[PDB]
Short mmCIF file of all heavy atoms in Angstrom, two decimals:
data_model
loop_
_atom_site.label_atom_id
_atom_site.label_comp_id
_atom_site.label_asym_id
_atom_site.label_seq_id
_atom_site.Cartn_x
_atom_site.Cartn_y
_atom_site.Cartn_z
N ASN A 67 0.81 -1.21 0.00
CA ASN A 67 0.00 0.00 0.00
C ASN A 67 0.85 1.26 0.00
O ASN A 67 0.32 2.35 -0.25
CB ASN A 67 -0.94 -0.02 1.20
CG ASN A 67 -1.89 -1.18 1.15
OD1 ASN A 67 -1.86 -2.06 2.01
ND2 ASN A 67 -2.73 -1.22 0.13
N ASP A 68 2.15 1.15 0.28
CA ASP A 68 3.04 2.30 0.20
C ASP A 68 4.19 2.05 -0.77
O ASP A 68 5.35 2.30 -0.43
CB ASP A 68 3.56 2.66 1.58
CG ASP A 68 4.27 1.51 2.27
OD1 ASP A 68 4.61 0.52 1.60
OD2 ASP A 68 4.47 1.60 3.50
N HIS A 69 3.89 1.53 -1.95
CA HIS A 69 4.95 1.30 -2.93
C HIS A 69 5.43 2.57 -3.61
O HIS A 69 6.54 2.59 -4.13
CB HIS A 69 4.47 0.30 -3.98
CG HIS A 69 3.35 0.81 -4.82
ND1 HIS A 69 2.03 0.72 -4.43
CD2 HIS A 69 3.34 1.41 -6.03
CE1 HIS A 69 1.27 1.24 -5.37
NE2 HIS A 69 2.04 1.67 -6.35
N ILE A 70 4.63 3.63 -3.60
CA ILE A 70 5.08 4.89 -4.18
C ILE A 70 6.18 5.51 -3.33
O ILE A 70 7.21 5.96 -3.84
CB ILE A 70 3.90 5.87 -4.34
CG1 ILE A 70 2.81 5.27 -5.23
CG2 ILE A 70 4.38 7.15 -4.94
CD1 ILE A 70 3.11 5.35 -6.69
N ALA A 71 5.99 5.52 -2.01
CA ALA A 71 7.01 6.07 -1.13
C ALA A 71 8.29 5.24 -1.20
O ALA A 71 9.39 5.80 -1.22
CB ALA A 71 6.49 6.13 0.30
N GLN A 72 8.16 3.92 -1.23
CA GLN A 72 9.34 3.07 -1.32
C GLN A 72 10.05 3.26 -2.64
O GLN A 72 11.28 3.29 -2.69
CB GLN A 72 8.95 1.61 -1.13
CG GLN A 72 8.32 1.32 0.20
CD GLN A 72 9.22 1.70 1.34
OE1 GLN A 72 10.43 1.48 1.28
NE2 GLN A 72 8.65 2.27 2.39
N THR A 73 9.29 3.39 -3.73
CA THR A 73 9.92 3.62 -5.03
C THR A 73 10.68 4.93 -5.04
O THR A 73 11.79 5.01 -5.56
CB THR A 73 8.87 3.61 -6.13
OG1 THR A 73 8.01 2.48 -5.96
CG2 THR A 73 9.56 3.49 -7.46
N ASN A 74 10.10 5.98 -4.45
CA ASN A 74 10.77 7.27 -4.44
C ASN A 74 12.02 7.25 -3.57
O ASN A 74 13.04 7.86 -3.92
CB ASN A 74 9.80 8.35 -3.98
CG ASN A 74 8.86 8.79 -5.08
OD1 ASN A 74 9.14 8.59 -6.25
ND2 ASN A 74 7.74 9.37 -4.69
N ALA A 75 11.97 6.57 -2.43
CA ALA A 75 13.17 6.43 -1.61
C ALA A 75 14.25 5.66 -2.35
O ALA A 75 15.43 6.02 -2.30
CB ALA A 75 12.83 5.74 -0.29
N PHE A 76 13.86 4.59 -3.05
CA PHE A 76 14.82 3.82 -3.82
C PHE A 76 15.44 4.66 -4.91
O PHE A 76 16.64 4.56 -5.17
CB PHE A 76 14.11 2.59 -4.39
CG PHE A 76 15.03 1.54 -4.92
CD1 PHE A 76 16.12 1.13 -4.19
CD2 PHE A 76 14.77 0.93 -6.13
CE1 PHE A 76 16.95 0.15 -4.67
CE2 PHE A 76 15.60 -0.04 -6.61
CZ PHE A 76 16.69 -0.43 -5.88
N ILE A 77 14.64 5.51 -5.56
CA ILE A 77 15.17 6.39 -6.59
C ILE A 77 16.16 7.37 -6.00
O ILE A 77 17.20 7.66 -6.59
CB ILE A 77 14.03 7.14 -7.30
CG1 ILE A 77 13.10 6.16 -8.01
CG2 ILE A 77 14.58 8.10 -8.31
CD1 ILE A 77 13.82 5.10 -8.75
N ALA A 78 15.86 7.90 -4.81
CA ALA A 78 16.78 8.83 -4.18
C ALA A 78 18.09 8.16 -3.81
O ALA A 78 19.15 8.79 -3.88
CB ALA A 78 16.15 9.45 -2.94
N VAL A 79 18.05 6.88 -3.43
CA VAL A 79 19.28 6.18 -3.09
C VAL A 79 20.09 5.87 -4.34
O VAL A 79 21.32 6.03 -4.36
CB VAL A 79 18.97 4.90 -2.29
CG1 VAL A 79 20.12 3.93 -2.39
CG2 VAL A 79 18.71 5.24 -0.86
N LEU A 80 19.43 5.42 -5.41
CA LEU A 80 20.15 5.01 -6.61
C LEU A 80 20.90 6.17 -7.24
O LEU A 80 21.93 5.95 -7.90
CB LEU A 80 19.18 4.43 -7.64
CG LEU A 80 18.48 3.13 -7.32
CD1 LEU A 80 17.45 2.88 -8.37
CD2 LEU A 80 19.47 1.99 -7.25
N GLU A 81 20.41 7.39 -7.09
CA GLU A 81 21.05 8.57 -7.64
C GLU A 81 22.00 9.24 -6.66
O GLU A 81 22.33 10.41 -6.84
CB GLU A 81 19.99 9.57 -8.10
CG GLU A 81 19.20 9.13 -9.31
CD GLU A 81 18.10 10.12 -9.66
OE1 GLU A 81 17.62 10.83 -8.76
OE2 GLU A 81 17.71 10.18 -10.84
N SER A 82 22.42 8.54 -5.62
CA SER A 82 23.41 9.09 -4.72
C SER A 82 24.80 8.92 -5.31
O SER A 82 25.09 7.89 -5.93
CB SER A 82 23.34 8.42 -3.36
OG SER A 82 23.28 7.02 -3.50
N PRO A 83 25.69 9.89 -5.12
CA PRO A 83 26.96 9.89 -5.85
C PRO A 83 27.85 8.71 -5.49
O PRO A 83 27.90 8.27 -4.34
CB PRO A 83 27.61 11.21 -5.43
CG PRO A 83 26.50 12.02 -4.86
CD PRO A 83 25.56 11.06 -4.25
N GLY A 84 28.54 8.18 -6.49
CA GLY A 84 29.59 7.22 -6.27
C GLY A 84 29.10 5.79 -6.21
O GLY A 84 27.92 5.51 -6.00
N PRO A 85 30.02 4.84 -6.39
CA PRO A 85 29.65 3.43 -6.28
C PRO A 85 29.29 3.06 -4.86
O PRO A 85 29.57 3.77 -3.90
CB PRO A 85 30.92 2.70 -6.74
CG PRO A 85 32.01 3.65 -6.48
CD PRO A 85 31.44 5.01 -6.70
N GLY A 86 28.64 1.90 -4.73
CA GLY A 86 28.18 1.44 -3.44
C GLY A 86 28.15 -0.07 -3.39
O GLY A 86 28.29 -0.76 -4.40
N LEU A 87 27.94 -0.59 -2.18
CA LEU A 87 28.03 -2.01 -1.94
C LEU A 87 26.69 -2.68 -2.20
O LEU A 87 25.68 -2.34 -1.58
CB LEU A 87 28.50 -2.25 -0.51
CG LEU A 87 28.88 -3.65 -0.04
CD1 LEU A 87 30.02 -3.55 0.92
CD2 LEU A 87 27.69 -4.28 0.64
N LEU A 88 26.69 -3.67 -3.09
CA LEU A 88 25.49 -4.32 -3.59
C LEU A 88 25.49 -5.77 -3.15
O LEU A 88 26.53 -6.42 -3.13
CB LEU A 88 25.43 -4.24 -5.12
CG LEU A 88 24.52 -5.22 -5.86
CD1 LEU A 88 23.06 -4.95 -5.57
CD2 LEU A 88 24.77 -5.19 -7.36
N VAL A 89 24.31 -6.27 -2.77
CA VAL A 89 24.17 -7.66 -2.38
C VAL A 89 23.40 -8.40 -3.46
O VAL A 89 22.17 -8.48 -3.42
CB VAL A 89 23.46 -7.78 -1.02
CG1 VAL A 89 23.40 -9.22 -0.58
CG2 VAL A 89 24.19 -6.97 0.01
N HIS A 90 24.11 -8.94 -4.44
CA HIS A 90 23.47 -9.71 -5.48
C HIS A 90 22.92 -11.00 -4.88
O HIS A 90 23.61 -11.67 -4.10
CB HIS A 90 24.46 -10.02 -6.59
CG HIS A 90 23.83 -10.27 -7.92
ND1 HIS A 90 23.32 -11.49 -8.28
CD2 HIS A 90 23.65 -9.46 -8.99
CE1 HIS A 90 22.84 -11.42 -9.51
NE2 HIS A 90 23.03 -10.20 -9.96
N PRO A 91 21.69 -11.39 -5.23
CA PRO A 91 21.07 -12.53 -4.55
C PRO A 91 21.81 -13.84 -4.74
O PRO A 91 21.81 -14.68 -3.84
CB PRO A 91 19.67 -12.58 -5.16
CG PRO A 91 19.44 -11.23 -5.70
CD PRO A 91 20.76 -10.75 -6.17
N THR A 92 22.43 -14.05 -5.90
CA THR A 92 23.11 -15.30 -6.19
C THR A 92 24.61 -15.15 -6.35
O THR A 92 25.29 -16.15 -6.61
CB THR A 92 22.51 -15.94 -7.44
OG1 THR A 92 22.94 -15.21 -8.59
CG2 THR A 92 21.01 -15.92 -7.38
N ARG A 93 25.16 -13.95 -6.19
CA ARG A 93 26.60 -13.75 -6.24
C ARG A 93 27.14 -13.06 -5.00
O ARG A 93 28.33 -12.71 -4.97
CB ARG A 93 27.03 -12.97 -7.48
CG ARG A 93 27.20 -13.81 -8.73
CD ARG A 93 25.91 -13.93 -9.48
NE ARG A 93 26.08 -14.60 -10.77
CZ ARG A 93 25.88 -15.89 -10.97
NH1 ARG A 93 25.51 -16.68 -9.97
NH2 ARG A 93 26.06 -16.41 -12.17
N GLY A 94 26.32 -12.83 -3.98
CA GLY A 94 26.87 -12.27 -2.77
C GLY A 94 27.19 -10.80 -2.92
O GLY A 94 26.65 -10.09 -3.75
N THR A 95 28.10 -10.34 -2.07
CA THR A 95 28.42 -8.93 -1.98
C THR A 95 29.46 -8.53 -3.03
O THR A 95 30.47 -9.21 -3.19
CB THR A 95 28.94 -8.59 -0.58
OG1 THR A 95 27.88 -8.74 0.37
CG2 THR A 95 29.45 -7.18 -0.54
N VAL A 96 29.19 -7.43 -3.73
CA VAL A 96 30.10 -6.84 -4.70
C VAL A 96 30.07 -5.33 -4.53
O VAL A 96 29.22 -4.78 -3.83
CB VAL A 96 29.75 -7.23 -6.15
CG1 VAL A 96 29.88 -8.71 -6.35
CG2 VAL A 96 28.35 -6.81 -6.46
N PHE A 97 30.93 -4.64 -5.25
CA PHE A 97 30.90 -3.21 -5.24
C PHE A 97 30.41 -2.90 -6.61
O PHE A 97 31.07 -3.23 -7.58
CB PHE A 97 32.26 -2.62 -5.04
CG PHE A 97 32.39 -1.83 -3.79
CD1 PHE A 97 32.40 -2.45 -2.56
CD2 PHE A 97 32.50 -0.46 -3.84
CE1 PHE A 97 32.52 -1.72 -1.40
CE2 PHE A 97 32.62 0.28 -2.69
CZ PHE A 97 32.63 -0.35 -1.46
N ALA A 98 29.27 -2.28 -6.72
CA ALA A 98 28.65 -1.98 -7.99
C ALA A 98 28.31 -0.51 -8.06
O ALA A 98 28.38 0.21 -7.06
CB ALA A 98 27.39 -2.82 -8.20
N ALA A 99 27.94 -0.06 -9.25
CA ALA A 99 27.52 1.31 -9.46
C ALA A 99 26.36 1.32 -10.44
O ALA A 99 26.43 0.67 -11.48
CB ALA A 99 28.66 2.16 -10.00
N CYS A 100 25.30 2.05 -10.10
CA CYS A 100 24.11 2.02 -10.93
C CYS A 100 24.38 2.69 -12.27
O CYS A 100 25.14 3.65 -12.37
CB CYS A 100 22.95 2.71 -10.23
SG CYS A 100 21.36 2.29 -10.95
N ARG A 101 23.74 2.16 -13.30
CA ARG A 101 23.91 2.65 -14.66
C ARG A 101 22.60 3.03 -15.32
O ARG A 101 22.62 3.87 -16.23
CB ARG A 101 24.61 1.61 -15.52
CG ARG A 101 25.27 2.16 -16.75
CD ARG A 101 26.54 1.40 -17.03
NE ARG A 101 26.32 -0.04 -17.00
CZ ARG A 101 26.32 -0.83 -18.06
NH1 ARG A 101 26.56 -0.33 -19.26
NH2 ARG A 101 26.11 -2.13 -17.92
N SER A 102 21.49 2.44 -14.92
CA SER A 102 20.16 2.76 -15.40
C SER A 102 19.16 2.07 -14.49
O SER A 102 19.43 0.98 -13.96
CB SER A 102 19.94 2.30 -16.84
OG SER A 102 19.42 0.99 -16.85
N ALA A 103 18.00 2.71 -14.32
CA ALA A 103 16.93 2.19 -13.48
C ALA A 103 15.61 2.66 -14.07
O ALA A 103 15.18 3.79 -13.82
CB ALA A 103 17.09 2.64 -12.04
N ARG A 104 14.98 1.80 -14.86
CA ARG A 104 13.68 2.12 -15.44
C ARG A 104 12.56 1.76 -14.48
O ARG A 104 12.55 0.66 -13.93
CB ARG A 104 13.50 1.39 -16.77
CG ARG A 104 14.25 1.99 -17.94
CD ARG A 104 15.53 1.24 -18.21
NE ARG A 104 15.25 -0.09 -18.74
CZ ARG A 104 16.17 -1.04 -18.89
NH1 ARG A 104 17.43 -0.82 -18.55
NH2 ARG A 104 15.82 -2.22 -19.39
N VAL A 105 11.61 2.67 -14.29
CA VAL A 105 10.57 2.53 -13.27
C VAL A 105 9.22 2.48 -13.98
O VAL A 105 8.63 3.52 -14.28
CB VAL A 105 10.60 3.67 -12.25
CG1 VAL A 105 9.55 3.45 -11.21
CG2 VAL A 105 11.96 3.77 -11.61
N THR A 106 8.70 1.29 -14.25
CA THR A 106 7.44 1.19 -14.96
C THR A 106 6.27 1.15 -13.99
O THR A 106 6.29 0.41 -13.01
CB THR A 106 7.41 -0.04 -15.85
OG1 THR A 106 8.00 -1.14 -15.15
CG2 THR A 106 8.19 0.22 -17.13
N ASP A 107 5.23 1.94 -14.27
CA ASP A 107 4.13 2.10 -13.33
C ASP A 107 2.88 2.54 -14.09
O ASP A 107 2.74 3.71 -14.43
CB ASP A 107 4.50 3.12 -12.26
CG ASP A 107 3.86 2.83 -10.93
OD1 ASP A 107 2.73 2.29 -10.93
OD2 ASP A 107 4.47 3.14 -9.89
N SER A 108 1.97 1.60 -14.32
CA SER A 108 0.68 1.90 -14.92
C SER A 108 -0.36 2.15 -13.84
O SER A 108 -0.16 1.81 -12.68
CB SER A 108 0.22 0.75 -15.81
OG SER A 108 1.14 0.50 -16.85
N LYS A 109 -1.48 2.75 -14.23
CA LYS A 109 -2.57 3.00 -13.30
C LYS A 109 -3.84 2.24 -13.64
O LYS A 109 -4.38 1.53 -12.78
CB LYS A 109 -2.90 4.49 -13.20
CG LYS A 109 -4.12 4.75 -12.34
CD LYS A 109 -4.36 6.22 -12.12
CE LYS A 109 -5.52 6.45 -11.18
NZ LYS A 109 -6.76 6.80 -11.92
#
């Protein structure tokens, strides 16, 4: 019921400067950097 707020918080985090530590579900912890994040949302 609050997926809009979570999506906006996630967007704010993804656009934070510099690489960051990512927990890939099947490869464990890596240091990654976001390159694109498409947000599809129909009504």
Side-chain angles (χ1 to χ4, degrees):
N67 298 116
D68 57 15
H69 65 275
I70 301 281
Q72 299 302 320
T73 313
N74 281 339
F76 194 47
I77 297 316
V79 159
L80 293 172
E81 291 176 333
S82 47
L87 189 145
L88 161 67
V89 183
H90 205 277
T92 73
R93 276 89 173 95
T95 293
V96 296
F97 243 71
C100 197
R101 201 145 49 109
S102 90
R104 283 100 70 190
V105 182
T106 41
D107 211 328
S108 300
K109 174 174 184 259

